[PDB]
Design a binder for this molecule. Structure first.
Ligand SMILES: [Mg+2]
Ligand SMILES: [Mg+2]
Ligand SMILES: [Mg+2]
Ligand SMILES: [Mg+2]
Ligand SMILES: [Mg+2]
Ligand SMILES: [Mg+2]
Ligand SMILES: [Mg+2]
Ligand SMILES: [Mg+2]
Ligand SMILES: [Mg+2]
Ligand SMILES: [Mg+2]
Ligand SMILES: [Mg+2]
Ligand SMILES: [Zn+2]
Lengths: 175, 142, 211, 38
RNA sequence: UCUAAGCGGGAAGCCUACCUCAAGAUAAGAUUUCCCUAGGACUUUAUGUCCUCUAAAGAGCCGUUCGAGACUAGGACGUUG
RNA sequence: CAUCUCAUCCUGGGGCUGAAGCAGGUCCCAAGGGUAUGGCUGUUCGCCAUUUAAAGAGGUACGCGAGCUGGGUUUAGAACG
RNA sequence: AAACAAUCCAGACCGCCAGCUAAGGCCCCAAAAUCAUAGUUAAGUGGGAAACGAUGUGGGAAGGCAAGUCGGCCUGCGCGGAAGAUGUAACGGGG
């Protein structure tokens, strides 16, 4: 696979140990873990992972590509994490990151208290704006999607919680 | 010379303990049924129970292949007008692994008084420990 | 949750200052005496076994004589268990008493009792069956069951079919009752509503499980 | 969603996917081109 | 690209949860308390047979009964009531 | 007096919409519970009146006369065309 | 062949605790291979069904463009299409 067969670059500073089928990526801003599929083994030169299948089957190449992509994300986020941005559209829609919770006002009869997990941190520069960040790309995406699920953008005016990198299907109601 | 039957008074039952960790359910149950019926002895008689006692430990670690952990259904009928009940292999093995082993083995045994007597000799335990150390079972590795 | 064992003494009414009349049942509560405590190491479950009332010594067998003498209680007319938790077992101990002050005014409780026995009853009284027409040519079947099944498929009567039989005299629980008053000098509970059984019958009062 | 026995691309933005042994059509252009075989 | 590896959300439906029954659950479960501790003989030498002494805890019969009940069963009591 | 099916009538959960909102249309999942009273007619049905969250579609010897009825139809009387 | 006049194998003179075979079978119920070698299937398909739909997966003969990629065929085995009334209930069952 072309995604595999390409070695991931380890920047200077992050360590990656391979105890067993487990793989631990320690960095300046996190300690992530990963499991290696039984059909793929690992080895460095000094600072470059080269994931390669064993037995050379199609399943093994698929799994090796998956392990390479996930380990590249792990190294990237443990060295310098990922961040996602949410934008709230519509009047009255406000957001406040207080403590480790997000208090959201999205046109409901009660404000929503979202509790961020231990990996993800949130911040608010403007009321109609959230910036989340973490080392875990998967966990960050999950938190962003669960927040967005509270009020998704509607086609008729775009009101709701949206990604900054998100194109909205717009509509209208011509009679 | 005529062919002799095993006398029930001289049948010698022996105790065995088998570990079910990571074994195929049906492929272990066939061997259990063969041992319980006494089919491995030269005194074998179809109307006599000359089988052995079989202790199954770690019964909740038995395995099925394919997608059977979710697809294998176990049914019951309470004999009430709509009372057909259904459970999963993985729900029942996390709740009653002894019922799984008993259902697997009882279907591979004869159906009658002798069959019930034969099923009485299979002792199934979900953990690593059984209470029959007084009986000193030998490790039957299948 | 630990409860009380009392006797249905009868029904009354309580007038509130605002003029509302409240139907109430009076439960007489002889203070319950703890006879035994069951724990996890000995029985496999935690419970408080309690006795109440009195029983003459010639009606007490030797087994129960010794069972009450092990504790420091006198023989009662019945023995009952309450399944409890830990931290509901702090100041409880054998030979102790559980009185009527275990409940508060306004607390919601469930009352369990033995309903009145009506003997053998037919479909009309036991299952709210409908009667057939009294006079439009109807023959000798007015309060009978009617059809009991179908024709040859299934060719039998299904289980759980509602027929005539013995009615009442069962254990019944009424949930959601309110404590109207707790008279600790008379050793009496007064609860709002109706409770199963006849006057003089044994009733179990527990804190409500709905919570 | 259209649940049909015949599923196929309609516009050029419709992708044919396989998910849990079900053939589906997901489209980014037109939400009305979503299809499931069934 | 929601899936192949991995991780989620998601219904008056399912399993629990609430109520009642329930160890004939022959796998017949558990806990507490209570009762029974005499001699011989004969061999078929073994939970062996017969004779004498014993008759417990308790259960029932019977009676007065019942808000329990077809009959039952169940509950209370029988003079220290 | 029922019991089952689901091809769902209501209530529950979703996709799309020629979905602004309200309300719909349509498809998917879902069988837990619920699911009229009358006038006419022997009627089933149907029409109508007034309700209802809804007044589902079926199977069960077109479920059910050793459970009831006997209005229709299909014995013998009688009459009309 | 679960059960099953008319299907398949086979035409019962009687006896036998003898042997060889037919159809059909050889994990257990239940006699005999948890036999051997090489492949295919992941659907419990096997163990019920069509037009039609699809980068499922194996093989073959070509073709175009040049770190290999594209889309056409012919086929093996699978997938959807596939809703019913007492109870799984469309391998006899366990599996
Ligand atoms: Mg008559
Ligand atoms: Mg009459
Ligand atoms: Mg029958
Ligand atoms: Mg449906
Ligand atoms: Mg009508
Ligand atoms: Mg009929
Ligand atoms: Mg008539
Ligand atoms: Mg046969
Ligand atoms: Mg031979
Ligand atoms: Mg065999
Ligand atoms: Mg083999
Ligand atoms: Zn499209």
């Amino acid at each position: 696979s072309r995604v595999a067969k390409a070695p991931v670059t380890v920047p200077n500073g992050v360590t990656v140990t391979q105890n067993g089928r487990q793989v631990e990526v320690k960095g300046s801003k996190g300690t992530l873990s990963f499991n290696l599929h039984a059909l793929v083994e690992l080895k460095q030169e000094e600072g470059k992972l080269q994931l390669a299948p064993a037995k050379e089957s199609k399943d093994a190449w698929m799994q090796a590509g998956t392990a390479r992509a996930v380990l590249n994300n792990l190294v990237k986020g443990v060295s310098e994490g990922f961040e996602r941005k949410l934008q709230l559209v519509g009047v009255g829609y406000k957001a406040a990151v207080k403590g480790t919770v997000v208090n959201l006002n999205l046109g409901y009869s009660h404000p929503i208290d979202y509790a961020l997990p231990e990996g993800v941190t949130a911040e608010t520069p403007t009321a109609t704006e959230i910036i989340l960040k973490s080392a875990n790309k998967q966990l960050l995406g999950q938190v962003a999607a669960e927040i967005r699920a509270y009020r998704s953008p509607e086609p008729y005016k775009g009101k709701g919680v949206r990604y900054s990198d998100e194109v909205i299907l717009r509509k209208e109601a011509k009679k | 010379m005529k062919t002799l039957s095993a006398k029930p008074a001289e049948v010698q039952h022996d105790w065995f303990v088998v570990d079910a960790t990571g074994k195929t359910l049906g492929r272990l149950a066939t061997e259990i049924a063969r041992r319980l019926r006494g089919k491995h002895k030269t005194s074998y008689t179809p109307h006599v129970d000359a089988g052995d006692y079989i202790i199954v430990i770690n019964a909740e670690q038995v395995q099925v292949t394919g997608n059977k952990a979710l697809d294998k259904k176990y049914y019951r009928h309470t004999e009430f007008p709509g009372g057909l009940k259904e459970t999963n292999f993985e729900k029942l093995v996390a709740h009653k692994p002894e019922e799984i082993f008993e259902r697997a083995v009882k279907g591979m045994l004869p159906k009658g008084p002798l069959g019930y007597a034969m099923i009485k000799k299979m002792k199934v335990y979900a953990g690593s420990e059984h209470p029959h150390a007084a009986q000193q079972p030998q490790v039957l590795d299948i | 949750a630990i409860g009380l064992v009392g006797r249905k003494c009868g029904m009354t009414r309580i007038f509130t200052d605002a003029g509302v009349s409240v139907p109430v049942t009076v439960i007489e509560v002889d203070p319950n005496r703890i006879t035994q405590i069951k724990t996890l190491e000995t029985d496999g479950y935690q419970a408080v076994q309690v006795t109440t009332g009195e029983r003459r010594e010639s009606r007490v067998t030797n087994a129960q004589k010794g069972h009450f003498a092990k504790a420091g209680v006198a023989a009662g007319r019945l023995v009952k268990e309450f399944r409890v938790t830990e931290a509901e077992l702090e100041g409880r101990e054998v030979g102790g008493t559980i009185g009527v002050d275990l409940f508060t005014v306004g607390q919601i409780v469930d009352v369990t009792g033995q309903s009145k026995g009506k003997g053998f009853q037919g479909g009309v009284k036991r299952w709210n069956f409908r009667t057939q027409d009294a006079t439009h040519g109807n023959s000798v079947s007015h309060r009978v069951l009617g059809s009991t099944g179908q024709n040859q498929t299934p060719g039998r009567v299904f289980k759980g079919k509602k027929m005539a039989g013995h009615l009442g005299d069962e254990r019944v629980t009424v949930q959601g009752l309110e404590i109207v008053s707790v008279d600790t000098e008379r050793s009496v509970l007064v609860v709002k509503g109706a409770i199963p059984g006849a006057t003089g019958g044994d009733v179990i009062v527990r804190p409500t499980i709905k919570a | 969603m259209k649940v049909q026995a015949s599923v196929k691309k309609i516009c050029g933005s419709c992708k044919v996917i396989r998910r849990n042994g079900v053939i589906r059509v997901i489209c980014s252009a037109e939400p009305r081109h979503k299809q499931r075989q069934g």
